């Protein structure tokens, strides 16, 4: 405990120093790391107070850019076994975060499903200690298209962590956060958005968000062509396609007036701008869906719909009260906990 | 890489194909397990089938994946069927975990077994008992007595216990240990007394465990006959000293009734000499 | 090492007996 800590720290200092003092590139210091990594291997259960991620970590970050150091998987996979599960849990949990990242960037999110299943097994740690876990976790769920779930996890990530390295970490989370609003199709206010991230960086997301709020396709295509790069950079490309659908879906919704008849022709004029002449087909899908609902006659060239003045006269507020009380109540129990 | 291509080959019916695939699979388990864990169920269908002869090999593989999943108990069950592809002293963590857990299974049964005739219960696993026989032998090679008695008490089997007691001069140290333990660990009478009773049989074969120890067990068990018989041989041999040691012990410790039966037998025989 | 095992067991049992009593004590005191 008292002797252990200087020996490890010397090793740790050894590693800081070799980067661009015994290297000039980020693949030459590595030779030196690998022989030193032995030490971790050597003592098994003669310790648990350690940090042992760093060596492997330096090697590992570089593979994330788009480089080939895929060897590292093999190495992390062995370590998850060395810790029993019932022994040396907190250190195992950290490792699992670094493996999960590596996998996320490149292919098969499916292997994460399993990782999650592992994650909930008897631990002496908590997976909310480093928020980064939530961030990775969120992308997984996002793909699967639970916009809500991803929102929770990301927002919890934002709590109790930025006020230092707020720089890089808030920007990555923040970019995904915006996208999730677009995906969910419910997009908040423009005032809010400014202050998150670095202002320069905020700008490409904002142009995209504005286009989607207007709900006009042509602008969405023009901006998107410019910003091929972001999606590429991030390592989440699939989003580029997914968003296309969303504009049209907002557009029908946007145009909700009032009267027992709206002319079909009227809807079609607004709609003309969104789509050449695929209008009725879209509309039909929309009504059927139950997001809005209506009756259409092409025969009399009118859409007939239902009227509402009966909000606050049925259960929709009842669900709200119940959900809202609950939030306050958990913290009220919590204050007492102290 | 994807595990999928390989995993599929087993789903196809052609027993050569399976066996080919199987050889690949046993090697690749550690790297792939996460992906393999979905597919476990089909692998098991093949193991259940006797229309496939590589049933023992399959079991071994399935089990490794359940260890990596974290279901030890389940892994064991398939593992007993593998049979002869179970091996001791390979000096692995996989092996250590399962032999340990086996003692525990035997323990799980003993409770139940106590309330029914004692030795073994009507449902037993011959295969499970066998791993335990092997564990003993393992431990005998080291020649450690302190370990030896710990396991025997703990697994709650008398038959193991008997074998263990060897040699003369180490045995009074060892017996003192066992005596304190049986009292202090067990507040369960049925078992606890049984071990003392097994121990008596052990005592007679030596010239002594301790002359005092021979008296103490009588006082615990309360068998007035047993004192009488031991005492009586002492008269004949003309061991005055051995005889006197008996009498101060019993007087102090025991009750009026206990004493009366013992004097009755003595008084018929004569004055002790 | 496996001789140790009974010795540890003794500690565990003791605590569970003590532990429950404390809950009970809390209730009584309230009243």
């Amino acid at each position: 405990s008292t002797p252990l800590l200087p020996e490890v720290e010397a090793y740790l200092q050894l590693l800081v120093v070799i980067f661009m003092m015994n290297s000039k590139r980020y693949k030459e210091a590595q030779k030196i790391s690998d022989d030193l990594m032995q030490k971790i291997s050597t003592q098994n259960r003669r310790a648990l107070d350690l940090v042992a991620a760093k060596c492997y970590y330096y090697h590992a970050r570089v593979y994330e850019f788009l480089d080939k150091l895929d060897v590292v998987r093999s190495f992390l996979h062995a370590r998850l076994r060395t810790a029993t599960l019932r022994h040396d849990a907190d250190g195992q949990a950290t490792l699992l975060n670094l493996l999960l990242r590596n996998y996320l960037h490149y292919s098969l999110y499916d292997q994460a499903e399993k990782l999650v299943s592992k994650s909930v097994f008897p631990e002496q740690a908590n997976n909310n200690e480093w928020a980064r876990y939530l961030y990775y976790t969120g992308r997984i769920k996002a793909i699967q298209l639970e916009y809500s779930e991803a929102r929770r996890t990301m927002t919890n990530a934002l709590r109790k962590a930025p006020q230092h390295t707020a720089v890089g970490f808030k920007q990555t989370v923040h970019k995904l956060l915006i996208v999730v609003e677009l995906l969910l199709g419910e997009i908040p206010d423009r005032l809010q958005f400014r202050q998150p991230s670095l202002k320069r960086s905020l700008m490409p997301y904002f142009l995209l968000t504005q286009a989607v709020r207007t709900g006009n396709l042509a602008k969405f295509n023009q901006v998107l062509d410019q910003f091929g790069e972001k999606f590429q950079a991030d390592g989440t490309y699939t989003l580029i396609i997914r968003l296309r659908h969303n504009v049209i879906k907002t557009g029908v919704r946007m145009i909700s007036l009032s009267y027992s008849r709206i002319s079909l022709a009227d809807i079609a004029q607004k709609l003309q701008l969104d789509s050449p002449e695929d209008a009725e087909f879209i509309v039909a899908k929309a009504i059927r869906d139950g997001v809005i609902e209506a009756s259409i006659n092409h025969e009399k060239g009118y859409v007939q719909s239902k009227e509402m003045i009966d909000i606050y006269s049925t259960r929709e507020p009842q669900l709200a009260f119940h959900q809202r009380i609950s939030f306050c109540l958990d913290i009220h129990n919590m204050s007492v906990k102290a | 890489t994807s595990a999928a291509g390989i995993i599929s080959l087993l789903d196809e019916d052609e027993p050569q194909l399976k066996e080919f695939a199987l050889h690949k699979l046993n090697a690749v388990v550690n790297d792939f397990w996460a992906e393999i864990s979905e597919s476990v169920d089909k692998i098991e269908v093949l193991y259940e089938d006797e229309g496939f002869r590589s049933r023992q090999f399959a079991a071994l593989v399935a089990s490794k994946v359940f260890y990596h999943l974290g279901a030890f108990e389940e892994s064991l069950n398939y593992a007993l069927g593998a049979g002869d592809l179970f091996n001791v002293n390979d000096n692995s963590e996989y092996v250590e975990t399962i032999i340990a857990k086996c003692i525990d299974h035997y323990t799980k049964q003993c409770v139940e077994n106590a309330d029914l005739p004692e030795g073994e219960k009507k449902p037993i696993d011959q295969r499970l008992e066998g791993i335990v026989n092997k564990m003993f032998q393992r431990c005998l090679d080291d020649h450690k007595y302190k370990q030896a008695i710990g396991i025997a008490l703990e697994t709650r089997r008398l038959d193991v216990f008997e074998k263990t007691i060897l040699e003369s001069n180490d045995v009074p140290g060892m017996l003192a240990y066992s005596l304190k333990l049986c009292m202090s660990l067990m507040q369960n009478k049925q078992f606890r007394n049984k071990v003392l009773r097994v121990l008596v049989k052990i005592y007679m074969n030596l010239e002594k465990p301790d002359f005092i120890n021979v008296c103490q067990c009588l006082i615990f068990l309360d068998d007035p006959q047993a004192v009488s018989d031991i005492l009586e041989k002492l008269v004949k041999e003309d061991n005055l000293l051995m005889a006197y040691q008996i009498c101060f012990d019993l007087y102090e410790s025991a009750s009026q009734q206990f004493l009366s039966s013992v004097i009755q037998n003595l008084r018929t025989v004569g004055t002790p000499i | 090492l496996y001789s140790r095992y009974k010795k540890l067991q003794q500690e565990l049992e003791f605590l569970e007996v003590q532990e429950e009593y404390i809950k009970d004590e809390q209730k009584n005191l309230k009243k």
Partner: peptide, 27 residues
Amino acid sequence: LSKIEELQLIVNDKSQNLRRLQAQRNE
């Protein structure tokens, strides 16, 4: 080997609860 160690962990954990819970009682 693992059995004595696992046994050892659970005692460590229980005691920290008991100390805490106890501390509320004295107060």
